[PDB]
Amino acid sequence: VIDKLIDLQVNSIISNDEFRALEQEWLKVQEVCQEDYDNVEVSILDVKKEELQYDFERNLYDISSSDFFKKVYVSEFDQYGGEPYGAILGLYNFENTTNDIIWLTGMGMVAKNSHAPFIASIDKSFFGVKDLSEITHIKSFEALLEHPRYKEWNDFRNLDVAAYIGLTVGDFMLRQPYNPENNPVQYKLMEGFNEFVDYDKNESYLWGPASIHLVKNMMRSYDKTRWFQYIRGVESGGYVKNLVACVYDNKGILETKSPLNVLFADYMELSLANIGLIPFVSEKGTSNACFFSVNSAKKVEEFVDGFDSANSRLIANLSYTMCISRISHYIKCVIRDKIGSIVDVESIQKILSDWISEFVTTVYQPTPLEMARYPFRNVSIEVKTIPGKPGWYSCKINVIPHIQFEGMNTTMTIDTRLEPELFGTNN
Amino acid sequence: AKNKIPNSRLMINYETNVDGVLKKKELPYRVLVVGDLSKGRSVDAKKEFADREVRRVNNGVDRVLEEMNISFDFEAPNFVSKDPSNLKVNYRIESVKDFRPDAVAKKVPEIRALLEMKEILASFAKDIENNRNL
Amino acid sequence: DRVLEEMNISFDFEAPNFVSKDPSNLKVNYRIESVKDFRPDAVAKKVPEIRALLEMKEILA
């Protein structure tokens, strides 16, 4: 009967707020630093959202004086011996508020300069619904954003900084609740504890933002390959194997619970990519996921001229701005060595090109991984000295990344005109 | 010596000096994460934002945590021990397995009182004594 | 947001009372900091009387 106490005593503080707030805010921290690669050193910075809300909202029109900006740009990226950051990870959930909109406007103001794509997640409060599962009911989010409720948001999608924000939808279950027959608490070598239940039913037992696995794939897409082509699709990047599902015996026979918050359909995968969101879609039953879309919050536009239309399609694509960013981490990092050396217009075009040259191809290699070694297709690098300043220059590169698959239509038909020898008149 | 040795008729010297540009070790792709971890309860969290040394997680999330003094003194319903006063959960997080409904009963002094009996009370040999056999 | 706060834009205009006790119409009296001050929310945070009802919604609810 002492078990009856413990099953009440401990279960009183595990269900308690504040206590399970740290759980959420550490389980999803453990999730990131689970892989441990050869050359991918993560790093923490525990800060309340309000302590940054006040920061950017006070220094939106003076970002260089922002305290955070002075702990990522001018601190490690700018300074000599400093080690620059790469792809920040916002563990927060951002709504459609006109306050949280600035939070992104500021963090992106940093990311844009520090060159570090800021990945985050968006709350279910965005779509104006109290249960994220009920987003499936919305037909097309494309027609949704036309609603005047998103006016402030559509303005933000037009900003340049938004080409570095990458917001994720859906939240993966990060902990299985405690049952004796399922996920038993590892008791002690004598203190019988394994017989210990919890208390949940519908949908309210710990969640974590998809942004984790998104970044935790960018890390993977670096130890294996070297660039960030390997974070999309099933066969290529985002697959995310083996998630923490859940099972429960209400009355039937252990009816499984999908690991993901929401079971996105096919046209949901797409109808979100246009809004500038990253859906974390699940394979029904398979207890797995995959990132089909990896788009920034940047507007895609349309345009009449075909070239212009294609430009905006690649810029919105996050996976490229991750790569183009890695060139900035090459320039402002390596060329710093020869800051005093005597060099020319024809010499800088050598050093900068001789490097990137090993990462540009046209031929395709078997398998995705063996080819994702080569992110770019071709590059131009036209540097040129400026008048007045003798030792100063001004470069201007332009990279065309290997355009990813994105979909296709198809019209099948019985022609009966292909082989006229069987249906023709002459016989 | 700068004075330099007097030159003989056959001075051999052997040059051992080598010039060249030093190498640079690769940069580990750093990943910054920003979220309310401590809720305002840590050595680096209690300090002003102008001076918060970012962590590294060189070891693991188990030890980078213990490096931060994450404790909490939140109240909770009492169902153990005597006297009034709600149960006051008060202990600092070492590993990430601390939220495990088990490491909790080992940490909270009051609950440990019931777990202490389950070591002694439940270990009653009513199977060695009952199994008498002449 | 800040060029506004640079100007001491306050106002002491009267308004119908539906909070607290005693007579006297509610007297909205606070200076504008940001442009989001006209937001029916930052108002309840500023006006002392209304904040009394919002204070209960933190504890009571």
**Are A235 and A136 in a shared domain?**
yes
Residue A292 shares a structural domain with residue A304 = no
Q: CB A2 to CB B77 under 8 A?
A: no
Domain termination residue (choose one: A259, A275, A299): A299
Q: By the 8 A CB rule, do A276 and A163 touch?
A: no
Are A320 and A291 members of one domain? no
- Measure CA B107 to chain center: 16
How many other β-carbons are positioned within 10 Å of the β-carbon of residue A315?
A: 18
Q: Tell me, yes or no, whether A287 and A381 share the same domain.
A: no
Residue with tokens 């389950």: B118
Domain tally, chain A: 2
Method: cryo-EM
Question: A34 in a domain, yes or no?
Answer: yes
Q: Tokens representing B55? A: 């962590």
User: Do residues A279 and A237 both lie within one domain?
Assistant: yes
Q: Residues A254, A320: one domain?
A: no
| A169 and A276 housed in the same domain | yes
Round to whole Å and give the CA distance between B37 and B72.
Answer: 13
Q: Is residue A274 part of a domain?
A: yes
Q: Which residues contact A299 (CB under 8 A, 6 or more apart)?
A: A154, A157, A158, A162, A276, A312, A316
Residue A204 lies in a domain: yes
Asked if residue A234 and residue A107 are part of one domain, the reply reads yes
Is A246 part of a structural domain of the chain? yes
- Give the neighbours of chain C: at least 3 Cβ pairs within 8 Å: A
Strands (E), C1-61: 12-15, 26-29
Q: Does A44 touch chain B (CB under 8 A)?
A: yes
> Which residues are CB-contacts of A156 (< 8 A; sequence separation ≥ 6)?
A101, A104, A105, A162, A297
Residue of A nearest to C3 (CA): A61
How many CB atoms within 10 Å of residue A241? 9
Bridge-based pairing state of the strands B73-76 and A393-394: unpaired
Q: Is residue A419 part of a domain?
A: no
Name the residue facing B101 among A30, A178, A218 (closest C-beta). A178
Across the interface, of A25, A44, A178, the residue whose CB is closest to B54 is A44
- Is A186 within 8 Å of B100 when comparing Cβ atoms? yes
A102 touches chain B (CB under 8 A): no
Cα dist from A356 to A91, A250, A349, A352, B22, whole Å: 33, 59, 11, 7, 21
Residue A425 in any domain: the answer is: no
| Separation of alpha carbons A174 and A205, rounded Å | 9
A258/A325 same-domain check: no
**Contact between C36 and A98 using a beta-carbon 8 Å cutoff:** yes
Q: Is residue A418 part of a domain?
A: no
Task: Give the number of residues written for chain B.
Answer: 134
- Convert A60-125 into a string of H (helix), E (strand) and C (coil): CCCHHHCCCHHHCHHHHHCCCCCCCECCCEEEEEECCCCCHHHHHHHHHHHHHHHCCCCEEEECCC
**Same-domain pairing of A130 and A273:** yes
Shared domain for A308 and A290, answered yes or no, is no
Token pair belonging to A39: 């050359």
Domain encompassing residue A92 = 1-299
Of A246, A273, A299, the domain-final residue: A299
Residues 169-228 of chain A with CB under 8 A from chain B are 178, 185-188, 190-193, 196, 198, 215, 218-219, 222
Shared domain for A309 and A263, answered yes or no, is no
Q: What phi-psi label fits residue A298: left (phi over 0), alpha (psi between -120 and 50 degrees) or beta?
A: beta
Nearest-CA distance C34 → chain A (Å):
10
